Amino acid sequence: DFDNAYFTLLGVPNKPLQCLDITETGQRLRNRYHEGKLAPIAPGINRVDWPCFTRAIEDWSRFVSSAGEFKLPCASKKVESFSGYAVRYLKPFCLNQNPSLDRYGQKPLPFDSLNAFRRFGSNYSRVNYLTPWH
């Protein structure tokens, strides 16, 4: 929503004040991420992970909030548009993370094999005739 040709100032597009809808913040399942993307490397901060967050992003977030959301005044208008320099850092081989990894693991085991060390859920015990754990 920060891209508009008619609101270009010094080569950067900016978002006007008349395009902000007040109901967008209470929309949990409209602006959401679906899949995302994995990388075949070790965890860490790198150049190919897209939503990788360093210690320079939280300082920028605290700075922009204390900078009044990057207002752009105009002639005969106190505040006209919102500067696009405050949302640049939320704008963007690699594999999919959502394909399941359990299919290449071991088979699930029956319950008595899982009960090899301490016994849980036996009918002939004290705890079967007590109130369970909710």
Binding site: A5, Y6, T8, L9, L10, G11, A75
Partner: peptide, 28 residues
């Protein structure tokens, strides 16, 4: 063209512009 959208921003009867097409720009 991003040059067009910056020149045409301040075109009008009572609008002051400092940008110049293909040259030096004003110091103000």
């Amino acid at each position: 063209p991003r040059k067009l959208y910056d020149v045409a921003r301040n075109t009008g009867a009572h609008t002051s512009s400092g940008l110049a097409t293909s040259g030096f720009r004003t110091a103000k």
